[PDB]
């Protein structure tokens, strides 16, 4: 059973000598080694240490190489021999690692045997060119009513979830991942500097509430070396860039791009590189810029010339949702302002709405989406235009609501409706909502079916309406979940459904 396979491993062996460059470790400190030798070292090459650890050749100085250790470093010593591999950093890619949890090197930490990757990709790659890229005009439904109505996400867009601590940034991202269980959009969650028990709690939620089969989990815990944290997101992008170049849509979430920036700062300062504004290195913009501009939608010519004529009429994409943490809501800090310039829309999650219990605590007016309504499906586009105006009018008329009454009934109506649409756009954490369910709930608000129900029952009203609609008119829900189409016949049918439901509870 076992040992005939070990015999086979004895058979699969190489007995002849081969030749390479060899270096000597001069110094070891804080995860950085200085290597004398390696005249053939090159920028970004992998150096093989004893113990099957790699280092990355970062500084090439005139007489020494500065390399960062990707692992436990403390047992390395002066005078050890390090061999030069010739490889720029590669990671496994494929469907075989779809559904598993790996580290930055792509080795599985799952504990569930080895990978069946189809091949390897370079962690560093250039983004698709200007002419190779196509306009974003397909939806990614996040399943939250507020985001999908006001701040729509399209297949290829790069939205930013920016907020303070403990405001639901992770909750929103993983709910986005969970809603992809049945779309063709594969999903990737990159956990940078998260603590391992938090990651484990998330992964268990992903299997329990739905499917971890469609998600690749990349992990670099806070105990691992800064080199592994820094690179992690690029390794995840190489795994998502595999699907993009094959013709299939994908969605990658990068959790704390601020922690990646911190890791790069540590590496840069230990390599003595000149400091900038917050001690961050000069190229800290060129870190996130070159990371996020790989998230793209790509035309059929490119995907047909990449695959060499296997898919023919497809257009691949890779949507990105980076997550950033501001400190006391400072939006002018260096890393936040870089990322806000690089991305195209942000979902700003304000903290005092979250403390107020309006979860998810999205803040309209400061949260925008630069791709516009070309990413929305048509029914969600028709039923959401007024919502933005109604909330804008509620912002200004909220000041009056605090202390005053016996205003004009025009205003009174407008304010009330604002306060109840605000009440409508909140939902429980692990309940995602399909387009038909969101649609009809927005229609109920927009056509005024709530205007007499403008009281605390709105939560019960929505739950009852969703149950009733499922009980009686599910072929409409199938037709809307298929098409997202809207017309006079749909408008009338939605009226008929709402008119009937009011007669019930």
């Amino acid at each position: 059973e076992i040992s005939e396979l070990i015999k086979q491993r004895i058979a699969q062996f190489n007995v002849v000598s081969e030749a390479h460059n060899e270096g000597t470790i001069v110094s070891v400190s804080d995860g950085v080694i200085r290597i004398h030798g390696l005249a053939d070292a090159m920028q970004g090459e992998m150096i093989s240490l004893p113990g099957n650890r790699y280092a990355i050749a970062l500084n090439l100085e005139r007489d020494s190489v500065g390399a960062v250790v990707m692992g436990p470093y403390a047992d390395l010593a002066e005078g050890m021999k390090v061999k030069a591999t010739g490889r720029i950093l590669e990671v496994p890619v494929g469907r075989g690692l779809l559904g598993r949890v790996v580290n930055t090197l792509g080795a599985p930490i799952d504990g569930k045997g080895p990978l069946d990757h189809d091949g390897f990709s370079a962690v560093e790659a250039i983004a698709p060119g200007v002419i190779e890229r196509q306009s974003v005009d397909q939806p990614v439904q996040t399943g939250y009513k507020a985001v999908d109505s006001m701040i729509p996400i399209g297949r290829g867009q790069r939205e930013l979830i920016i907020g303070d601590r403990q405001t639901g940034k992770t909750a929103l991202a993983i709910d986005a991942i969970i809603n992809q269980r049945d779309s063709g959009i594969k999903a990737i969650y990159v956990a940078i500097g998260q603590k391992a028990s938090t990651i484990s709690n998330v992964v268990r939620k992903l299997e329990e509430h739905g499917a971890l089969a469609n998600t690749i989990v990349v992990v670099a815990t806070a105990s691992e070396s800064a080199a592994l944290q820094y690179l992690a997101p690029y390794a995840g992008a190489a795994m998502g860039e595999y699907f993009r170049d094959r013709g299939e849509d994908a969605l990658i979430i990068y959790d704390d791009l601020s922690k990646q920036a911190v890791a790069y700062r540590q590496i840069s300062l230990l390599l003595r590189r000149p400091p900038g504004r917050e001690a961050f290195p000069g190229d800290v913009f060129y870190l996130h810029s070159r990371l996020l501009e790989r998230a793209a939608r790509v035309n059929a010519e490119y995907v047909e010339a990449f695959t060499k004529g296997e898919v023919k009429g497809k257009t691949g994409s890779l949507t990105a949702l980076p997550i950033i943490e501001t400190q006391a809501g400072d939006v002018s800090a260096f890393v936040p302002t870089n990322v806000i310039s690089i991305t195209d829309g942000q979902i700003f999650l304000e903290t005092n709405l979250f403390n107020a219990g309006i979860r998810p605590a999205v803040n309209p007016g400061i949260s925008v989406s630069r791709v516009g309504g070309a990413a929305q499906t048509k029914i969600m586009k028709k039923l959401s235009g007024g919502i933005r105006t109604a909330l804008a009018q509620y912002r200004e008329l909220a000041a009056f609501s605090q202390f005053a009454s016996d205003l004009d009934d025009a205003t009174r109506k407008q304010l009330d409706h604002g306060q109840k649409v605000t009440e409508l756009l909140k939902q429980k954490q692990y309940a995602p909502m399909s387009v038909a369910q969101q649609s009809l709930v927005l229609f109920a608000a927009e056509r005024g079916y709530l205007a007499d129900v403008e009281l605390s029952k709105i939560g019960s009203f929505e739950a009852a309406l969703l149950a009733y609609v499922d009980r009686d008119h599910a072929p409409l829900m199938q037709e809307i979940n298929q098409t997202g189409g809207y017309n006079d016949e749909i408008e009338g049918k939605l009226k008929g459904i709402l008119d009937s439901f009011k007669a019930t509870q």
Partner: protein
């Protein structure tokens, strides 16, 4: 035999040169006679040909260039086990209580790797505490990490002495107290308190006070973990109390530049996040056993944005933010209910009535905060009646969060109160539902259960 010589002594940092064969590896210990005093050095860097740069685990005074150094080929190793119970030790695990030898069976190295991702164990076994505000706003499970954040003088120590009283005495498992950078008087007062209460036989104490050279304050936290990890690997449930996580990072800052490192954002070391991570990822509950830990976190200048408190916020299951405002107003414990939270505050894992009460309380207090400056400038008469109502209920809720502690009796001259979790929910729900709207604010201040609020209301 001795094998190295001292070549530099700049402040607390000592450089030793060795033969280019058998240079000491990183984190090893070394030994030198500082006169009659045996001095330990810890290796921090292998730099250049044959040289190592090191930190003194003791005073650097009295060292000469050219002294002989002997390399111990292991890290700093400390006694671990039952023999550590009831004994005060220093960072090196030497007794400082004058009761004699430790008598240890086994010794363990203080530098070890954290548990692997597949070893971690999930728990939601909620602990109950007497403290109303904490059990309402930030309940925490057995096996979780709790952090008490505050600036100077807000109640971190008094809270931790109360939590030690309430949790540890019911706990039948062994406990560790790590006094990182503690005041020597407070360490003596704690030792005597435990000795009188007769709970000293189940606590091991490691103390590294403020007066000690930076290496001691740097490494004493790891000796605390190494003892707690021995108990966890025996399979016990352990309570670990750490007096300040901040003065570990600060002990790193002091020596970082002399180690040649380029400075970072607020003068901190470049390795602040890794130094915090490597320590805090060992404090976990595995499948074999559970560590439950309560940490106090100093907040420099009372700004929660400073890198040091800012990073440690991301490691903790519950975070009880104390605030200087509430302490200055004289409400004790000074917990901010809006900033503090727990990941165990879920309707699924707490009772759904608990969750609804918590959401109500937070919503009300947030609604008070925005009204505060409006009343201050434009006056209370320019509120409306439903706001005048919610501002009253807000004041009643903000009084009922206060509580007398048995360990904060010496300061105030009053008995100490323990409230059960159920009574806390029942009271705050009653206040929000207005069943006590007619009682004055002082009828809720410094009281136990709401039955005691009506008894004191009767006396009022």
């Amino acid at each position: 035999m001795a094998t190295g010589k001292i070549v530099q002594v700049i402040g607390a940092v000592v450089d030793v040169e060795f033969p280019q064969d058998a240079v000491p590896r990183v984190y090893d210990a070394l030994e030198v006679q500082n006169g009659n005093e045996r001095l330990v050095l810890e290796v921090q860097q292998q730099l250049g040909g044959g040289i190592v740069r090191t930190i003194a685990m003791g005073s650097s005074d009295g060292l000469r260039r050219g002294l002989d150094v002997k390399d111990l080929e292991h890290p700093i190793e400390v006694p671990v086990g039952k023999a550590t119970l009831g004994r005060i030790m220093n960072v090196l695990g030497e007794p400082v209580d004058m009761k004699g030898e430790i008598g240890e069976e086994e010794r363990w190295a203080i530098h070890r790797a954290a548990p692997s991702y597949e070893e971690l164990s999930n728990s939601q076994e909620l602990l109950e505490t007497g403290i109303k505000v904490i059990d309402l706003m930030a309940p925490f499970a057995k096996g979780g990490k709790v952090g008490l954040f505050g600036g100077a003088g807000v109640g971190k120590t008094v809270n931790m002495m109360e939590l030690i009283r309430n949790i540890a005495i019911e706990h039948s498992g062994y406990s560790v107290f790590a006094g990182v950078g503690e005041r020597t008087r407070e360490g003596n007062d704690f030792y005597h308190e435990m000795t009188d209460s007769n709970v000293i036989d189940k606590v091991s104490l490691v103390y590294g006070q403020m007066n000690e050279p930076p290496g001691n304050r740097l490494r004493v936290a790891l000796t605390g973990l190494t003892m707690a990890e021995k108990f966890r690997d025996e399979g016990r449930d352990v309570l670990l109390f750490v007096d300040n996580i901040y003065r570990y990072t600060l002990a790193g800052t002091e020596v970082s530049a002399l180690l040649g490192r380029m400075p970072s954002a607020v003068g901190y070391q470049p390795t602040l996040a890794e130094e915090m991570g490597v320590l805090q990822e060992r404090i976990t509950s595995t499948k074999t056993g559970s560590i439950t830990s309560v940490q106090a976190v100093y907040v420099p200048a009372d700004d929660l944005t400073d890198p040091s408190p800012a990073t440690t916020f991301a490691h903790l299951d519950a975070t009880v933010v104390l605030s200087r405002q509430i302490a200055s107003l004289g409400i004790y414990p000074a917990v901010d209910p809006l900033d503090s939270t727990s990941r165990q505050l879920d309707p699924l894992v707490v009772g759904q009535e608990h969750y609804d009460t918590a959401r109500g309380v937070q919503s009300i207090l947030q609604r008070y905060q925005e009204l505060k400056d409006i009343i201050a400038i434009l006056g209370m008469d320019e509120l409306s009646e439903e706001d005048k109502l919610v501002v009253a209920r807000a004041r009643k809720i903000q009084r009922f969060l206060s509580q007398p502690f048995f360990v904060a009796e010496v300061f105030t001259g009053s008995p100490g109160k323990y409230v059960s979790l159920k009574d806390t929910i029942r009271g705050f729900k009653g206040i929000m539902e207005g069943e006590y709207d007619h009682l004055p604010e002082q009828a809720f201040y410094m009281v136990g259960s709401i039955e005691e609020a009506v008894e004191k209301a009767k006396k009022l």
